[PDB]
Structures are given as C-alpha cells and as structure tokens.
Amino acid sequence: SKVSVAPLHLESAKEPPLNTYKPKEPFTATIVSVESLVGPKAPGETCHIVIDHGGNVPYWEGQSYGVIPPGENPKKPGAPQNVRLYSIASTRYGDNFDGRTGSLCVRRAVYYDPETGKEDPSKNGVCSNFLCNSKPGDKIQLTGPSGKIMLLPEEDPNATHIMIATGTGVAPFRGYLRRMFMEDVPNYRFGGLAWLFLGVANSDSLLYDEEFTSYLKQYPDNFRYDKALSREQKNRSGGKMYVQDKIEEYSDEIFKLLDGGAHIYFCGLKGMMPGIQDTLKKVAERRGESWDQKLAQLKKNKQWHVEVA
Ligand SMILES: Cc1cc2nc3c(=O)[nH]c(=O)nc-3n(C[C@H](O)[C@H](O)[C@H](O)COP(=O)(O)OP(=O)(O)OC[C@H]3O[C@@H](n4cnc5c(N)ncnc54)[C@H](O)[C@@H]3O)c2cc1C
C-alpha cells in the first residue's frame, strides 16, 4: 500500500517555506547519492541527486532549491557563484520518507563546438556538472526553497492535474505524483485524475519511467501516462514527436478536462511553450473555439501553471 512517511508535522504549515536560506549564508547540505537516470543512447547525462538537508530546509512539492556551486563568479572577481535553481524532484518527505532529504534531477550542460563537435569543458555548465560529479559526503550550498507557481493546489483532492514535462521538467511532477500515489499522507487522499505527458529524446532518456509505469498498474483509474520520444517518433506533420503532438492526440479529452476545471502544468524547456500554444490554438480552431479566450479564462481561474527555462 502507500509508504509510511514522517514526520507528519511537515503537513502543519499553512504557507510554503520561502527563502529560509539566502545566498550569503546558505545551508551546507550533504550529498547522499548521485546516480545516472539514463541509458547509453541518451544525448547527455541526467542524474538524480539525493541531498541530506537534515530537516533544515523543508519545502513543498513544486518548489526549487538554489545551489551555489563552488568558485568565484567569473563576472565579479572575489564574489561567489550565482545561485542556480533546480526544481525539487522529491516530495517534502524525500526519497527516504523521513523529511531529511530532497532530490534533484539535473541534466549536465555540456558544450560541443557546433562545427567540429569538439567538447570544451571550459564552456560546460558549472553547477549542473558540479552536481552530477558529486559523491556521497560532498557538501552542497543550498538556498531557498523558492517558487510558488508550481505549488500543488490541494483544496480539491479530486481535482484533475494535467502535467506536461520536457526532460528534467519532469522534476516537480515526480514530487506531485509520489504525494498523490506513493506516500501515506492522511490529509491528502488524491482521488482525481493525474495525467503525465513526458517528452524525452529517446527510450534511454526516460526519467523515472519505472516509477510512473508502476502508477499505471496501481492507480489505473487515477493516472494516465503518455510519452513523446522525439528522436524515436515523428508527429502527424513529420516533425519530431513532441509533447504538443501528444497533447493533440488527446485534445478533445484535454479540452473537456480543462472545461471541467482541470489544472494544467508545464515544466521544462522554455522553447516548448510556443509549439504548445500553436497546437492548442489549432485544436481550438478545429473545435470552433478561441484559444486566446480559453487561455484567458484558464489564467483567470488559476488553472494554468508554467515554469520553464
Ligand atoms: C526555476 C528553475 C528550475 C530549474 N530546474 C532545473 C532542473 O530541475 N534541472 C536542471 O537540470 N536544470 C534546471 N534549471 C536550469 C538550472 O537552473 C541551470 O540553469 C542549469 O543547470 C545550467 O546551469 P550551469 O551552472 O550548469 O550552467 P552555467 O555555467 O550557468 O552555463 C549556462 C550555459 O551556458 C553554457 N556556456 C558556458 N560558457 C559558455 C561559452 N563560453 N560559450 C558558449 N556556451 C557557454 C553552458 O554550457 C550552459 O549550457 C532550472 C532553472 C530554473 C530557473
């Protein structure tokens, strides 16, 4: 059944923690584990990082941690590095169900010369490689937590939640879905529909697929799961199979759900939002609806939740 979690006093706060730790005095957390999430055919490594904050930096699902990688700011000598934000991929109880760890889902930013393909480690992303290079016992400077856009609306435990992720944008939704389905949270018994759409390059690039597939078998009446494998599938128009093409495959169901009050979440590449808007406008147009008016109503009704980068 659902996994026992502790401490239940993490449910007591009425407001999300915010900026508990700030950049000039971060919390020195400790790495528990780092593991690759992806297989050899993935275009790049995405790693899962479990971070022991000891209960000192609690958060709510949908929030981000800040990480200050070591070193000095290049554009400000003697200054610390800037914060990088990472959507937390764990529930508030974390992957050890004890309120002491949080997890990040981090893609290594690797530079390749556009013409030679030559790598240049000096142009690699500092924090993402710092994180995926981390080992148990290493220290991580944490700030935050931060973010309210992606907090899970729990007022209606039978709400519908349509989650659209690309790549590491899956992070908040791993947290949502563990709280909805995996953890024994007496004060949040989810009985609605959670529908995850996940776009990744190929099968080897899938993130937490075994976990999400397990929800299909455990909660078949409350969870749906669709993947867009961009380098293994192509869309109706011939472009690579992207999440927007998967949304289009279910557009009548999705619009009906939205009309019924469903929340819809977008997390991942900022570049996916224009193609999603184009798809939704085309879908609306075929239904004889104005997408612009629909989106205005969704935003007014606080059904529309976007965090992309
Ligand atoms: C709210 C929020 C949540 C986020 N959640 C996540 C998440 O869950 N997972 C995740 O992986 N990311 C997430 N991101 C992105 C993350 O914050 C970082 O921006 C990302 O990890 C890259 O930071 P970095 O320190 O590795 O790269 P930086 O060192 O900041 O470099 C940025 C980019 O510039 C490139 N670059 C550096 N120098 C050069 C050069 N000389 N020429 C050309 N290119 C260069 C790097 O290769 C890299 O791609 C999130 C962003 C936001 C705003």
Ligand SMILES: NC(=O)c1ccc[n+]([C@@H]2O[C@H](COP(=O)([O-])OP(=O)(O)OC[C@H]3O[C@@H](n4cnc5c(N)ncnc54)[C@H](OP(=O)(O)O)[C@@H]3O)[C@@H](O)[C@H]2O)c1
């Ligand atoms: N809270 C946040 O804001 C937050 C949280 C987590 C992640 N992020 C951001 O999310 C991004 C995730 O990048 P990643 O490296 O994990 O993913 P990625 O591998 O670059 O892309 C993931 C999938 O999205 C596809 N894709 C590319 N362009 C697209 C488009 N216009 N529309 C739809 N799909 C498209 C890719 O296909 P192809 O590569 O085959 O084209 C791939 O299949 C990062 O930029 C990160 O900063 C933001």
Ligand SMILES: [Mg+2]
């Ligand atoms: Mg895999």
